[PDB]
Ligand binder design. Structure first.
Ligand SMILES: [Cl-]
Lengths: 299, 308, 308, 313
């Protein structure tokens, strides 16, 4: 009755080599009718027991999967932009430390997450700032970065410092001129040491079409340089790595990375290239997203 | 959830809305009544119901008519508040200013906003409309460039109003002041600036607060414009400003500035200045002498000052 | 105008003397019917305004009322038997959640109240960087285990993903020599050392009126508790007793007690008492008059008793 | 959270829980033969269901029987190892120890607990019973007095067990050690100590971990008892301890300056226990495991592969 030693060797090929019961019967020359008897009776006590978890969390599993694959400090999987909004907001709430400098980008995504921050009763002693200039009309007002920065600060009962320059100027001499000003200096100065960043992700693939933004001439040229996505108007390729660069007021990615948490929030297969690039580039080290697009990134 | 407070609230309507007698109400509700007096009493003390008696209804009104008469204002409101704490004087004007503003707008209007403590209160107290009037909100001045708290920023104010008004809004992405003229000249060229200025040319109503030299607010002139420039201002005998346009105490009237011209502010059906002070009198007065404002929203003391 | 003085003068008597129209009409010698015309008007023209606050929050109000009356930094009144200790538990927990700052030292007491509040703290994913400790010794069998202070201290710490430091001495020893011997030990020194600088305390309130398992009779035994009634003791906290006027009452088990003194409890930023039931009114009052607690979590019912 | 995984769970349970096969499981739910397999594979891959194989079923069992034979243990469990790291070895024993413990209890039992990494992993793994078995939990030693992390405290362990067992519990309010005797004696005279000791006198089962000198894991002897006392221990030849009672590698009780300072169960009483289960592993705990067996201070032994073979030389 110590044929047990076999039940280990048998369930061995059954649950690891998965050679079927007709495959197990013939290779070790055993009656396929005796191949079936060993496994089952054992289940009475040890002799190999399998456990199945009833309360399992798919989303949670996907988060760990994302963290593993991309080396993210954290991730959250959830007009389901609102679901992202709520859980992202929680991630951001949990992450804040007194004395932090949070930076903000623009758009439906970041707004979604700010719209869901918790109203606080005392100052959280953090400081909100924009990490990019104004849309220059290119965005609706409720999506303006300053609106979002100010809105956040209001939920967080916190200091805020709005930017009075555009993200994109007509020529380098105007932009560098602006960079010389004590106000730009002051703003960037917070950039140079921001703790948490909170960011949307652009791609070539809605009103915020790179076409409608920088205008065809320029976007057709972005496609030429193999640009996967952009962040804060700083562009990267699919492996994570520009005519308007000499004309852009925004945080340099280099500085974005020194940031304890750089939390990207995005969704949709249309933005996979951008999301990927952003991940490969380490420009973001946290990801808020939906279930669907999370699976795309794991494949 | 709450106690029989609903019943209390209801009897509040009877006695206060319909001015019915306690006895009549009691018979109607089959309530023993004494219970009624008790409830009426409670509703009042627990701030379920709050009654307010404008004691100054008469003098404020008279003062409004004099201001109209002396300066030929289209409209004028004089708020007064016994609590002499300043943030309270502002709420006084804010509430009333807002009402004035609510009833003055007309479908299709372009509202322009300036910055500051005052314009802000007016906005804070705007009636939260349930349906869009089809109005549009715009800054009539570039950004503070860090010189003002965020809750006082011009965009903040514009956008915030738009919310109450269910109006679309258009935020400005340039500063109110530039260190150099070249940059200012270059910026005027941009399509964006052209679009925002495009609205200034057709502005229908304006909420505008008034600055003066005497201000000791952090929003001081030596603070905003810095030492040297403040002298050149007092050196030219300047009484005050609106959207950083300067004028003397008689109304009479920059290559770095990005804001609406007074020319355009005057073309406005209603230019509404809102201010209080006495250290602002110099500037309020100059604003009236120049008809840079049709309407004036202000408190009792300031009005007293402007009448003698 | 002129009838404007009267509208006021009438509104004054209707709303400030809560006189009846019949009365107003009478004193003044006005036809009762114009007294009514004049009220109708007074409101129509905004000389008189009547706000009925539809989204009124009774509990909310009671909280402010308690804060005002007793100078509390905060207070929470809740509503729903034990099912109502649970309402307290949930909202208290929120108060405590909102109040925590990184680097805080939370101290805990014992009993159904505190457990309830802790049972409802939010499970955290990272360490809140706070430290949980007991501010009292063990029950020495006098309490069920799920109410033991260490259980509660440890439980809290587990919800808060936080440091915790359990106490290995009893709250009450047979004679002073033992008690001071214990006080000489490095472990007692260490524990108390946290007491000497605890940020948030979280505490239940004892009283004589109680006849649940935690009867002072059962705990200290008759001889002792009869003598507490003699010294006019209203309540207790962490086995430190006070009178109805919040006066401390040295009690004779005083020299046999391992627990935080209250000089020390008070140095504490937030000392949050959590209690309810008219049977404990004396204790809650004393605790409030004594300033031993500066926050109150409680139910609606007992909140009303405290404003009476 | 669904939808498919809401489904993988359904299928998994029939197929595994109910033994129902696929061609018929697919029959029940109107889906595909290819698909059921796909789903099962997915569930296995994604961790919804995990299966475990006891490769070492044979050697562990033989080792169990030898331990019983050499030392006359009532029972013995050997969890597998050398395919695992420190904290994992514990879980290995914990799980199995727990099972051993679950089946040994009998209605009306008094369970006593000691402190430490080991006794804890046994408790962590106790089966969460749905109905009270009328057992009672008690410390068999006073508190650590700060010398141990909270999650290892004796009360923590007792109370935590009681939770799994739906048993009432009784926590101790005195330390396991007191520098000074006035204090210690004053405590033994208390109604409370008397009550807790009252239980030691009738103890039915005991979870107990073993200490040694060769320890170098925070809970060191120089650390717990301090410099001088550690010498007097090595000076007297102690091989190890159970509830701070000391003994030599032959089982004989060793006396120490401490005996008159200690507040814990006497070894006389631990032996009176129906089952006294020691749980330990580690070539450095050898000296102390062995002494515990030579003294029959433990009937049962829960331990890993490496140590098992060590005791069998
Ligand atoms: Cl808990």
């Amino acid at each position: 009755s110590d044929d047990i030693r076999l039940i280990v060797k048998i369930a061995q090929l059954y649950y690891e080599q998965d050679m079927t019961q007709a495959q197990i019967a013939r290779e070790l020359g055993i009656y396929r009718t005796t191949i079936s008897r060993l496994l089952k009776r054992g289940r009475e006590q040890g002799i190999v027991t399998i456990a199945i978890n009833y309360d399992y969390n798919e989303n949670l599993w996907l988060e760990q999967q994302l963290k593993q694959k991309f080396g993210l400090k954290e991730a959250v999987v959830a007009e389901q932009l609102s679901a992202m909004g709520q859980h992202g907001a929680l991630l951001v709430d949990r992450l804040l430390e007194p004395g932090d400098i949070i930076g903000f980008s623009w758009g439906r995504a970041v707004r979604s997450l700010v719209e869901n921050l918790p109203q606080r009763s005392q100052s959280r002693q953090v400081i909100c700032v924009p990490i990019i200039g104004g849309p220059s009309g290119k965005l609706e007002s409720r999506y303006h970065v300053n609106t979002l920065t100010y809105g956040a600060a209001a939920r967080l009962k916190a200091e805020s410092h709005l930017a009075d320059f555009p993200a994109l100027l007509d020529n380098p001499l105007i932009r560098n001129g602006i960079m010389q000003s004590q106000h730009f200096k002051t703003i960037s100065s917070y950039w140079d040491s921001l703790d948490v960043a909170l960011v949307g992700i652009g791609s070539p693939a809605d009103g915020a079409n790179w076409h409608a933004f920088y205008g065809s001439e320029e976007s057709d040229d972005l496609n030429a340089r193999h640009v996967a996505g952009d962040i804060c108007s700083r562009f990267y390729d699919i492996n994570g790595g520009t005519n308007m660069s000499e004309k852009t007021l925004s945080i340099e990615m280099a500085k974005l990375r020194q940031a304890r948490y750089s939390i990207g929030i995005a969704m949709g297969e249309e933005k996979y290239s951008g999301i990927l690039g952003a991940l490969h580039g380490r420009y973001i080290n946290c990801l808020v997203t939906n279930r669907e697009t999370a699976e795309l990134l794991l494949k």
